[PDB]
Amino acid sequence: PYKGWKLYFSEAYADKSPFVQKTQAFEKFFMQRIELYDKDEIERKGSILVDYKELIEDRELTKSIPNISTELRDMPQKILQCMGLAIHQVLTKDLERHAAELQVQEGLPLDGEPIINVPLIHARLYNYEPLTQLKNVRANCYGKYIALRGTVVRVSNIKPLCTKLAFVCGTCGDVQSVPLPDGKYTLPTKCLVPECRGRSFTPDRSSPLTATVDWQSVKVQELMSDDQREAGRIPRTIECELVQDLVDSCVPGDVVTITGVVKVSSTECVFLLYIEANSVSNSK
Amino acid sequence: PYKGWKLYFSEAYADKSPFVQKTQAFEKFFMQRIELYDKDEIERKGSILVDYKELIEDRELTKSIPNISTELRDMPQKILQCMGLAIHQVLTKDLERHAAELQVQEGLPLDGEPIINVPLIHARLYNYEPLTQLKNVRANCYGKYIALRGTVVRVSNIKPLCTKLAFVCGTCGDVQSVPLPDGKYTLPTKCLVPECRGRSFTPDRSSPLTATVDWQSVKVQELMSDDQREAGRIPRTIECELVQDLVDSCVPGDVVTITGVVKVSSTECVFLLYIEANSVSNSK
Amino acid sequence: PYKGWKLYFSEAYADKSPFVQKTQAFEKFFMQRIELYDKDEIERKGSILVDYKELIEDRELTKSIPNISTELRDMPQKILQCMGLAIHQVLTKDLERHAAELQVQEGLPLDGEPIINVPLIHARLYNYEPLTQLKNVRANCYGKYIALRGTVVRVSNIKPLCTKLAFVCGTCGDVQSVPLPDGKYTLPTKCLVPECRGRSFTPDRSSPLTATVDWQSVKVQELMSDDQREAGRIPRTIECELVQDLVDSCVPGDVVTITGVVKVSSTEVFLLYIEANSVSNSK
Amino acid sequence: ALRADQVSLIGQVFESYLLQHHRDDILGILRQGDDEAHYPVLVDALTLFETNMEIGEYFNAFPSQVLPIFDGALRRAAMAVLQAATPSPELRMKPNLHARISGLPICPELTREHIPKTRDVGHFLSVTGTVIRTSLVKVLEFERSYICNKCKHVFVAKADFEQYYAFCRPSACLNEEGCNSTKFTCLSGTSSSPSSCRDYQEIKIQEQVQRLSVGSIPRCMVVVLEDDLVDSCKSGDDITVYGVVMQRWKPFHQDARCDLELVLKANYVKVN
Amino acid sequence: ALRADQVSLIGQVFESYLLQHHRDDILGILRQGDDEAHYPVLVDALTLFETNMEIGEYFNAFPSQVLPIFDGALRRAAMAVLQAATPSPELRMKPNLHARISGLPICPELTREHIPKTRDVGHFLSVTGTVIRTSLVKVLEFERSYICNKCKHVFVAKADFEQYYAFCRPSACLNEEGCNSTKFTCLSGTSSSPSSCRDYQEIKIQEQVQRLSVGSIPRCMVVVLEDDLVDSCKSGDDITVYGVVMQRWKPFHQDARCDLELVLKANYVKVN
Amino acid sequence: ALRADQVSLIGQVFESYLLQHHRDDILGILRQGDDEAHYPVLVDALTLFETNMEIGEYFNAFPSQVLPIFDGALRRAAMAVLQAATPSPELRMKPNLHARISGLPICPELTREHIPKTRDVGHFLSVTGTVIRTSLVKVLEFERSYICNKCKHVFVAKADFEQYYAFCRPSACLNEEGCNSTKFTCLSGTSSSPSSCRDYQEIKIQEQVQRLSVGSIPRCMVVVLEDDLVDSCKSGDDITVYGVVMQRWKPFHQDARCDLELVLKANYVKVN
């Protein structure tokens, strides 16, 4: 029906919806830059890195979205999701146009990749200009996009995380997949058929619907100058949660500018902030 | 009714009860002795120290009650609370004459301190003549008043203890305070309202009715003769519980003659004797 | 009739069942050999040591039961129970013959201890020819009888084990004891009373019906050659349960050929632990 | 126990004093961009008490009730100072405002320089102790409200420090929510705004051994830090803590004795 | 179902014996006014056995049953000595009378010098072992008192040595109406005032190495001391713990193995 | 998912390949006396793939489903080899037959030396890692027959690899008649003798640091060995693990996040 309606359109298309305008602005920005990036490399990595200094651009790119920094700060997850929709849609339209061109060239109804199924891309942005160190990091910046400059001290070995868990209900008899934010498995509750309501709550790992993305934990401490003896005090360390392509990007002993949305850790005085990394830029 | 009756005794004021005669005898004894003691200092400390040798004085106190030592041994708490009622009542009646004279001179309808509430004072006696060393202390000493010539080794920092935890009932809608011996909340059960009866049980420390008295735990061990190397072995360490003014009176490394009633350490290896200290007399 | 089978349970001994015929074969074998063993010494020990090598002999020993090694491997518990039943029966019948002689001598039909209850003695087999090393020991060996030549490293102090736990039901008001395999108490469930049917489940130890046997846990490691430096690696060890007379027979630092039944240790994913049948010392 | 009219009087007096006193300070507070940030106003205790004695005695009697009234006075004083100020984009209103009490009237009775005893619960006094243990910045979501499906019900669950900073649990089914009440609502997961989380720190301060009041062993006082006061102090320095003495009690049990430890929810921390 | 006739015979014969030999010891016991120490009477085993053959076999067969009857015989013997004695207030009666049986005839069958195995449960025997670890003196409770408002409850349950010192409550009460509530919890019941709390010192004794009965590693027997016997044992000295061998079993769990370890409720720990 | 006809085709071609190639190995397998023992057939991947291209793609797509069909082909080939062999007592049938696939065709996508990432779950590959820890040989109660109040309940529960070896439960409740059938009574728990095990074990293989693919810290992969593969590897030995990558998830809790780690059920362990 609509572009990316299955996953990204949780809400149906609405011209009044502010989300649509952000999607159009981001997809236009990408469409200017499609020639530079490599489509196959992006699909292989499953993500795209876009410089934030290029994101903050005059005239049309800032006309559609008046305050890009404010919008990214207030709702980092929403803006990143809209940017991912924009990149996924521009890649889909590029593949559609390329398939049409291939059909024109060969002159045959059959074409390569008939399904034209585009895997999900998590758009990522780096070189975020406003940067906050441990002193600026506090509970106020919860749910706000921040940029750090701190070396990683401890790196966890790669571990999986269940981003989507399929739930099969005995009364329903069919599997239901629910989006899962950073684990913490959520009850599906309502189901498709009104009468059954999905009363049974059974996890099902066997289903292909259940998808898994790797989770890597790295702890970063902001750089502390050694010019003074008072300087060099033990620095605060904030945990970093990485996902998908970002895993293995960090290497211990290397300063990384981890610019991403930050969230509290329920498991862990009951919570403590960790930045759910959106992009990691290596020193080299 | 006698002022301060409810704070010391839950059971109502009844002249037929034998405790009344003990209270009157102690009131007379304090009346002879009230000149030496300072009323304001006693009120500030919340305690009074009376030498046991004064308790063993012949004639009247021996005639009024036959066996002070036996009554202290069998029921320490009842005799101690009777003595505290006596000191409270004699202080109240002295203040009553003073307020009566002051009212005579001033002729003011609202007298100074019209509520005239006198804080309850836990009467405490020192130099208890029968000494029961901790080695002599048997399990039958529970509920008995003993005196220990022991050296404190470990002094815990001052920790609050809830002597009264007012319980508000949601069904009733009112707040009722229950006497709380060393925690272990006692269900108020029946209340003033007959029908509601207090079905709900919700603790409420925010209420002013809830009161707290500090609790400092000190462990004492008997000094042992150093004639032989095999001698001088540290005897069993018996815990000691201080409360109210007694807290911070003990200092580690100092011998203290702790004369107090003993209870069982149900809170726990599993059970030890701890003396709920009544009076602690330092070496100096 | 036979004591302890028809009295406890309505079902009688079935000659059709091959287990009963196995008991007959073993009791005949003990009958021909009973001269060497001592009755009172065996009763004092509470068990009889019968050679597996002697039992593996041909002719009537193999004629009575075709595959003695295969039967003993497949269901060691049933074979050992039948063997102990046979030795118990032959000892009882020997004492009955002696009591008959005593009655003839005295001339009084009444005799001391007419009930003549005789303790149950577990039959024990040593020198088990098929030997399984600890490397060979696998989940396939579970439920089978193995013989291992290993040196015990750790011997736990003697600890009681409730082989029989009496149970009294509040509604019923009577006490019955249920057999208990290596602790892990099984609820009595049904009882004699039909209507009450034992709905109340109360474990008690004060009852004399409750019985207890020794349980000494010894851990054995297989003896390793010192020929090569590759040899000397950490040895495989399986826990060994010693019960009844077997306790204190093991001593730390000694090599013992523990020919015992192996079962799973549910407490600690399971690890095979050999419920020892017979422990033969080096000497 | 404060009456509504009395609360209004205290708030009005505090507003007038802080407007006449910290006009430049409140303007500078409104200067910064980050509205979510915590802001100290640093109103002096002794001069405020000289201005009106009733507010002083009420502050001494019930600090835990007076301070929210001071926060409301901050809110409306900020209203007035912003409407007075010319530039709107440069000067933004700060809903996150907290009153800081400093310069307490130096009296042995009014200010307990020693570590407080249990007699000092619900009393404002100036503990002077040297930090020994500095816990990390463990933020806490004080409000874990379970929003009702029906409109205007707005069920709210708030963490209380007396209850060992444990969130209130809606075990009772008095509300129409019933089982829906006790089940968790992932307000924090959906967005930042539904979750009201601001930071929480614990530091233990022992009385200075130089002072004659201290005993044989320096008694340790645990201090709960909040808002901007977090990270204001580091281990190993002389610290003066102006705060409200409070007691926290762990979820209590029938057999267990009550386990209370006195805490000082700091109202102002000054590094000496 | 115990016969009353045999109990009465054992009690009367034992009390007559102890009167005609241990009279002066009972005079000394009552003469000491203090109740601080539980008072032992120390009746010798072999002379008691030779005086009456029935007592010997009953005591060896059922020591845990005989010893309470011996305490009752002590109560009647104390009645007799009190009425016999001339001065009433100098010597007073003591409910806490306990019979300690020592001087057992040294025989391999009578006295199992080696630490008992599971064959020796419920048999009185000498365990000559050197104490290694001494636990702290404990109050415990003779019973977690069952307080019932309903009259003539006449239900008595006591802390069982066999059940790891855990209070036992039968499923159905003896009375026809039964208990008002299945479990009754009261402050008096939780407190040890209604119960006869006694010292409890749990020591572990190992075999003497010089003895031939010891193995490669000395076996260890855990010994429970009660009443006066607590504090009689000191670590590092040889102890001849005449006692009744029993079995403690921890609360059973269906998957878990029945966990029972041998114990010895001491009768008189004579220190060599 | 595989269809029945596809299963039949794959099994038939696998049986034909083993009959034409590994027949002598099957003879050697049935020659051994111990029937309960586990036996490797050692089928080679590249030859099997070049014989039939459908087998290659289907095995690479769904190893976990293909391997049981391979075991069924083992059983049929064992039927054929048993009827082929003249001596009956010498050649005994082996119910415990498990296919071993070795020598994958050299392809970076099919076989990748690196420790698998979460993308590699459900795919067959060669994971070359040096064993660091060798956990003890802990056999698994893989199957426990469950009978309940329901007539002929005969419920069969298999310890699932993805479930951290917790017994599987029906998604749709068949025990509608009573709660007794809903609850599970462990037959193995009551009596030790009746059970069955597959010789479970765990080793962790750490990627060789000398290789270019490995990162700064060599990643470790935990390997689950089942049946005869146990005791085939030792710590500190260069080990190549051809296996099927799956993931275990610990029992979930509402507050707790999904706790998973990649695991590798080895299909062949070869000492380099």
Numbering used by the authors:
A (entry chain D), B (entry chain F): 15 to 282, 293 to 308
C (entry chain B): 15 to 282, 294 to 308
D (entry chain E), E (entry chain A), F (entry chain C): 2 to 273
Passage from the reporting paper:
MCM8 and MCM9 proteins are structurally similar, with an MCM domain at the N-terminus (NTD) and an AAA+ ATPase domain at the C-terminus (CTD). The structures reveal that MCM8/9 is arranged into a heterohexamer through a threefold symmetry axis, creating a central channel that accommodates DNA.
Based on the electron density map, the structures of the NTD and CTD were reconstructed at the resolutions of 3.66 Å and 5.21 Å, respectively, and then aligned into a composite structure. The structure reveals that gMCM8 and gMCM9 alternately assemble into a pinwheel-like hexamer with a central channel. The assembly pattern of the gMCM8/9 complex with a threefold (C3) symmetry axis is unique among MCM helicases. In addition, a distinguishing feature of the gMCM8/9 is that the helical domain of gMCM8 contains a long α5 helix that protrudes around the hexameric ring. The dimer interface between NTDs of gMCM8 and gMCM9 is largely composed of the β-strands from the OB domain of gMCM9 and the flanking ZF and OB domain of gMCM8. Compared to the strong interaction between the dimer interface, the interaction within the trimer interface is weaker. The trimer interface is dominated by electrostatic interaction and hydrogen-bonding interactions.
